[PDB]
Amino acid sequence: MGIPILKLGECLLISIQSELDDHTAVEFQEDLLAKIHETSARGVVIDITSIDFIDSFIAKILGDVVSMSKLMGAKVVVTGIQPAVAITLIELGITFSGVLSAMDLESGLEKLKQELGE
Amino acid sequence: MGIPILKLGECLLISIQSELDDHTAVEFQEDLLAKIHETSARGVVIDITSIDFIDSFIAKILGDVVSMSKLMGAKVVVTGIQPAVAITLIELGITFSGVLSAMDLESGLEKLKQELGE
Amino acid sequence: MGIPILKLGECLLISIQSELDDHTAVEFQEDLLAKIHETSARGVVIDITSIDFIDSFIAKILGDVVSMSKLMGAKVVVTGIQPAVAITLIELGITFSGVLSAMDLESGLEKLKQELGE
Amino acid sequence: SALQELSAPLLPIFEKISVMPLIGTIDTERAKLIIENLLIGVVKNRSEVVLIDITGVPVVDTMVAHHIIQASEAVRLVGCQAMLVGIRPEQIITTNTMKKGMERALALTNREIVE
Amino acid sequence: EKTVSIQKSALQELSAPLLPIFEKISVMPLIGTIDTERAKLIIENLLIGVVKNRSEVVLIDITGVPVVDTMVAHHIIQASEAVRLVGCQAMLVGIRPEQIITTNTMKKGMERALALTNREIVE
Amino acid sequence: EKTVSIQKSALQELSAPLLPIFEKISVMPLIGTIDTERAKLIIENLLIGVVKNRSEVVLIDITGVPVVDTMVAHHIIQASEAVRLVGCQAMLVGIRPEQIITTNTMKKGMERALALTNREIVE
Amino acid sequence: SALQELSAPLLPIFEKISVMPLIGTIDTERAKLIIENLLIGVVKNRSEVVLIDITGVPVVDTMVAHHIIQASEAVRLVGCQAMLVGIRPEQIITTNTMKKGMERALALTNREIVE
């Protein structure tokens, strides 16, 4: 009801608009893995460009859906992270390695198809 | 708050989850045509697979942007029409000529990437 | 005195003779870094073949000036560790990985030299 | 006077830093990140040629050097001093000179300088 | 009377399809079955030691102890160098209070399983 | 024996490798386990199905009724293609009071699985 | 018992080790490290194929398979038995059989065999 999935030749996509609570994300966290069961995948591409502030528990969720989607087989790309979300709030207790971040959704595909699926 | 529209390499992939009324339809109509001039584009892929019922006051709004975007300067394709909504489209009776729709968002981008900008 | 630095072909075959004092190592620590800063090099070849006894702070200082000259931009190696000084590193839990050790000064030259251009 | 620096050569932007030893200028990572996302940011330099020295906390400066990798692309500290590193109480890439720090940055975009 | 409990342990097969090894588990991942790994390890050195495929696609779900099931993935580096882990479930990976190789399905697992043994399946 | 002897009826698996789908029958040899083929033929056409192994290489023995086992081997020519029968034991083939393709071992069945569907093992 | 059984070919020194179940036999660490620079050889296979079991001595065993790397090429523990992988309360390269670890041994140090 606001979070679409528009899979594109074994490569999924994710748009994320402005969220306000972690009760949205728990209904969302099951929806991504329920899609990656229904179709085969090689890399999901999470796009968080439209977010300027992040709850610290939501950063635990968005830091988790990386590792929820690594075990299924697919890679992840957390593309288009803004400054103000990244600079002083992702200095928290993350372990972001092997994440393959990108700059924008057009170049975010070709940093994934250059690695996997081709 | 709004219908999530993203962009891809020289294409736009708008996906529709659900609506409320004509007020959300004119707000989405103002969203897409502004964005296609807010940046540059040549092909719109409208995804309407998640809709099972459309009122006659709404199908003209999806009759507007399927023909107001061609005059704007980009070719359009409305992939994945459900069989329930496809009955009342022509039971009303409006030909989607020049639209060249497809079955799913993967195969929708096959023709549009081929036709303009090979 | 005691610690010569040679500057042979963009490499520093610096040797270490029978020296013992941690205060000499502090006197040594500035001599290696201020040489490679003022004279731009790419790989330092330390040589500790003569030393058979070490203090705990020597393993910290030799644990420093490998990680120190790595941060200055030099793939520093360590050549010819004696057995008895390698025995007393299984108790003092230093973590000499990413230090690129070698066997002797002959093979320790081309091992670094294969890791830079040639 | 608020000025830290910036430049913009061919594809990879990089940034100069002269000597300013304090912590209250956290703008040097704010004004970096608010402009790195504007243009198409790739690997960028720091060039601490004249900087002696940051006193007690470059943790703010060296953890944001990790956070450019999550924003766009990696970073490189070009030419630290012999005393700036002088005690290490706590990775990333580095280079000694700017003239070859730029050279192995164009390899990260796969470009070489022919005649 | 209790012949059901015997031949309940020994239903973790180790068929050798193309000689990496294969395996499959059903829904019984309780802590009493430590033979889910110690009966695949005693046979692992017996036959050829190249990559294992566990294929636990029907196992819903492990209870709270994966440190008998995901410590062995860092322990068949021993005597086999290797290990994958094929097709987890959504509520199964919902258990993450806290690397190794994983794959969506077996027919994509068997492709890169033959990459480590350096062989192709073509024509 | 409340739910253990019925959960162990859901232990006649069908793992799904590369396009020939193979089975692994460990121990369920009595006449009451008719479902070793019923839970095969139903799930045969469910996924995309071609020639199917059985791999009963550790099993002793079928008692007096191969009607449920080897007569139905002619019945998976209907939905699927011509099934094999991999590695009978020496005490099993002695029971012949009374064709079908068979194979001595498990890896050799996959050597002629791809000979049917025209594939090889290269590199 | 002065039993160590070196038996070293050209570059790769290796070892054959039966049951030696005491820390009083620490000399398989001492004689192995001293022999490592008496000949210039960089690969060391281990071959603990017949050894079961050990309880409180991997502190000699694993660390001597760790501190060869600071003096030579990496090592390989060959054929850890099935009653040995369970006792691991706490990496490197390793293998299964003795003749196939030797085939992997030359590949790391720029050599191969032909027929």
Place this chain on the structure above:
Amino acid sequence: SALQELSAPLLPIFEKISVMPLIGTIDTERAKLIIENLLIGVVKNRSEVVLIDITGVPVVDTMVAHHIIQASEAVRLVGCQAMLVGIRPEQIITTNTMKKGMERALALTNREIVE
């Protein structure tokens, strides 16, 4: 004690003999001949390079050297010492050291080594 210092490589299966020069230890005849059929080894080394000296042993050590030629093939002694060859009233191919006995052993069974 009861000990077999015999590794198990490929077809050049070799051995090692340390100082146990007493005739009661006949197991170096037993645990080599009885292990000889259990794995297919064509050529066979000894490497008795350490023990000095030998008085009542070597009739066993030369009946071993002619119960392998009739078992499979090509035993070879590797590196006898200087005192060890004083008065030997008792042929067999031999060599000088372990790293070069192997290359006269691979070449006997028509196998080669390149790079």
